[PDB]
């Protein structure tokens, strides 16, 4: 019963794009059969994949027709092709790998923002806040009047698009005080404060 190589489990091969978080292990499989037992070779971006091509190299388990790369990093991104063959034929399949770096930190604000501001009564002023966060952050502006008052809060109606800048027009002496940009995500809460000074 001599025959060319063939995929013995196409179910495990349907997932073509493997997008994984950095530091995880990636395993590509191309379960094959054939008589004689076909050989297996792996290519990265159409070229031979050598151990020296990545830190720590890679591992291959012939019994499982698999290619294993541990602790992936952004540079592992690319196409990986398995080429299986015997004297009666040659077949290949290609997977694409993408690596995404995750950050498990509470929101981080830029030092200096918002900045203190001063103006004469009747004037206009703004407070800006720049946030970095992987877990979706929730931003809001608060005035200390600890008795606090929410002046603006992100949401479906107040998109992040314009939540980062707080405008205070026709400032009165009542507007004077401490303003806070508070950013929170599932991991934690961060905030930076600025002071508004109003002059006669």
């Amino acid at each position: 019963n001599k025959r060319a190589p063939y995929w013995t489990n196409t179910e495990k091969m349907e997932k073509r794009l493997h997008a994984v978080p950095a530091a995880n292990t990636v395993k590509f499989r191309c379960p094959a059969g054939g008589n004689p037992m076909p050989t297996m070779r792996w290519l990265k971006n159409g070229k031979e994949f050598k151990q020296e091509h990545r830190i720590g190299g890679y591992k291959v388990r012939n019994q499982h027709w698999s290619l294993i790369m541990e602790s992936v990093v952004p540079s592992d991104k690319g196409n990986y092709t398995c080429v299986v063959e015997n004297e009666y034929g040659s077949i290949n399949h290609t997977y694409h790998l993408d690596v995404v770096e995750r950050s498990r930190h509470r929101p981080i604000l830029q030092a200096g923002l918002p900045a203190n501001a001063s103006t004469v009564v009747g004037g206009d002023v703004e407070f800006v806040c720049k946030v970095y966060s992987d877990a979706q952050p929730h931003i809001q502006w608060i005035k200390h009047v600890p008795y606090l008052k929410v002046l603006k809060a992100a949401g479906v109606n107040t998109t992040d698009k314009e939540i980062e800048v707080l405008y205070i027009r026709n400032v009165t002496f009542e507007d004077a005080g401490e303003y806070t940009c508070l950013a929170g995500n599932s991991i934690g809460i961060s905030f930076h404060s600025a002071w508004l000074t109003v002059l006669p």
Partner: protein
């Protein structure tokens, strides 16, 4: 690391490797084509740890109904909010704030999975947010 929270994103499901897709007509499913215009989504926090997911093109918000069915409505309701959690394996999960035990999920076939059939250790509930560019 590279990226920004207010930028639209694609939500990649580890199960089968499908991108969450929100159709103009409200249908929700998954596809593998990175070029598809209905997989570009906008995440927005309504409060700490809670977000709404909007299909930009479809201009509809993802939502989970009383029976665990997924779909997207033109108007935002309490069924459009999900607790976003970053699991230890570094993938995200989206659990309904209204139906607190059901997760957003995709089956290996590319169709959504009933919320009522989801659970914390399933591959179907694991998503990875990715840039909506190129």
């Amino acid at each position: 690391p590279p990226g920004h929270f207010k930028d639209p994103k694609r939500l990649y499901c580890k199960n089968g490797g499908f991108f969450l897709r929100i159709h103009p007509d409200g249908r929700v499913d998954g596809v593998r084509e990175k070029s598809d215009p209905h997989i570009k989504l906008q995440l927005q926090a309504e409060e700490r740890g809670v977000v709404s997911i909007k299909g930009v093109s479809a201009n509809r918000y993802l939502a989970m109904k009383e029976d665990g069915r997924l779909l997207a409505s033109k108007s935002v309701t309490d069924e459009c909010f999900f607790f976003e959690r970053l699991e230890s394996n570094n993938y995200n999960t989206y659990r309904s704030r209204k139906y607190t035990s059901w997760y957003v999920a995709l089956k290996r076939t590319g169709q959504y999975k009933l919320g009522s059939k989801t659970g914390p250790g399933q591959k179907a509930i694991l998503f990875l947010p990715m840039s909506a560019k190129s």
